[PDB]
Amino acid sequence: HMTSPFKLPDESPSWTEWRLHNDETNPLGFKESWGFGKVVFKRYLRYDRTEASLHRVLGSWTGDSVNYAASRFFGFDQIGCQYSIRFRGVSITVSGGSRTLQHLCEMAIRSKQELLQLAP
Amino acid sequence: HMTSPFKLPDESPSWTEWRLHNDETNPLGFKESWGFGKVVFKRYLRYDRTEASLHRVLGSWTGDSVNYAASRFFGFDQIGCQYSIRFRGVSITVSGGSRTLQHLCEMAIRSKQELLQLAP
RNA sequence: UUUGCUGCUGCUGCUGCUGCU
RNA sequence: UUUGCUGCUGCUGCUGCUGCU
């Protein structure tokens, strides 16, 4: 078991749940991922566009959680790191080498927030 | 001559200029691009981290300029659109289908600004 | 604008490398 | 953390398509 950058578990909806959601309604949430070298950790999280929910999903990873997970993969040569998020058909990615990871985190967290607060 | 999304011309430094810059000093600027289907338009722009300069480079494209350039490429099937920017070893990308382009623009402009205002 | 996955398409991004500039 | 380009590497992102879920 590798250690993930994430502090919340995955919330991927089942196929049945997704169909039921489509018949009765606005996505159920958003997808995000962190990639270090060749390893990618992924989350689907429920998000309902309220403030409480935004605050919850914003705690799904931190500088520290990403750094502890990422450093597992560090070597002589710098590795590529990447955060990806998709909400409503819009994807943001923030990437660079492992030496920039603090800065990637900084931009990822703003991006996640800008995207999730974006009006339809 | 295709029509570009950009309102400023490219400012790529020569190899000699770049060497001279490296011997005497902090990058000379940043790189950005807009991709519609298979066509990508690219800029290198000088940016010195002042407010006046930030304002100048922020005018290098607009919603309208991106839309007029992009619509050249629209068909039956939605196309993939993407804005990419790299400054100080950190790359942001904003992508999606052509139906989301207004929203991509909205997130691209914020991203460009967050990244260029980021402290080293 | 959509749950998760398979295989294909075209175009980016990032990492490392290469040769010129 | 770096001007622009050539060719290679590995991993994403996006578009369209596919078969299951």
Side-chain angles (χ1 to χ4, degrees):
Chain A
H1 58 126
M2 296 194 248
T3 296
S4 127
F6 295 106
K7 305 175 83 188
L8 300 178
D10 188 73
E11 302 167 356
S12 283
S14 79
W15 186 38
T16 295
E17 192 197 340
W18 178 84
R19 288 182 293 170
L20 282 166
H21 174 70
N22 287 150
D23 300 338
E24 72 186 332
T25 57
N26 184 71
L28 276 177
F30 72 92
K31 310 166 57 156
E32 73 182 345
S33 80
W34 274 103
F36 311 113
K38 35 174 71 205
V39 173
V40 176
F41 303 91
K42 283 171 151 30
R43 289 294 178 272
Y44 193 100
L45 293 180
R46 308 310 173 97
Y47 176 53
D48 72 3
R49 318 246 313 116
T50 60
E51 276 293 304
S53 181
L54 179 67
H55 184 252
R56 187 190 76 84
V57 306
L58 250 18
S60 76
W61 58 270
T62 63
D64 286 339
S65 77
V66 164
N67 206 85
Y68 179 69
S71 55
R72 182 51 180 84
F73 303 96
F74 290 169
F76 169 59
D77 295 333
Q78 183 169 225
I79 55 173
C81 299
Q82 171 161 342
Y83 172 73
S84 301
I85 185 177
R86 186 196 183 111
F87 184 47
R88 283 167 157 168
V90 175
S91 167
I92 303 184
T93 74
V94 182
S95 43
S98 41
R99 297 190 208 102
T100 69
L101 184 62
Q102 196 166 138
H103 282 332
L104 305 176
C105 286
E106 276 151 28
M107 295 293 110
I109 202 61
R110 307 210 204 326
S111 297
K112 179 181 178 163
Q113 205 178 318
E114 88 192 20
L115 180 56
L116 297 186
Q117 263 167 161
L118 182 63
Chain B
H1 58 126
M2 296 194 248
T3 296
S4 127
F6 295 106
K7 305 175 83 188
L8 300 178
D10 188 73
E11 302 167 356
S12 283
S14 79
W15 186 38
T16 295
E17 192 197 340
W18 178 84
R19 288 182 293 170
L20 282 166
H21 174 70
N22 287 150
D23 300 338
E24 72 186 332
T25 57
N26 184 71
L28 276 177
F30 72 92
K31 310 166 57 156
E32 73 182 345
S33 80
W34 274 103
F36 311 113
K38 35 174 71 205
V39 173
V40 176
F41 303 91
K42 283 171 151 30
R43 289 294 178 272
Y44 193 100
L45 293 180
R46 308 310 173 97
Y47 176 53
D48 72 3
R49 318 246 313 116
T50 60
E51 276 293 304
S53 181
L54 179 67
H55 184 252
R56 187 190 76 84
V57 306
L58 250 18
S60 76
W61 58 270
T62 63
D64 286 339
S65 77
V66 164
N67 206 85
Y68 179 69
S71 55
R72 182 51 180 84
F73 303 96
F74 290 169
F76 169 59
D77 295 333
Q78 183 169 225
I79 55 173
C81 299
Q82 171 161 342
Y83 172 73
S84 301
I85 185 177
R86 186 196 183 111
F87 184 47
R88 283 167 157 168
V90 175
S91 167
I92 303 184
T93 74
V94 182
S95 43
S98 41
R99 297 190 208 102
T100 69
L101 184 62
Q102 196 166 138
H103 282 332
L104 305 176
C105 286
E106 276 151 28
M107 295 293 110
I109 202 61
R110 307 210 204 326
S111 297
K112 179 181 178 163
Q113 205 178 318
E114 88 192 20
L115 180 56
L116 297 186
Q117 263 167 161
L118 182 63

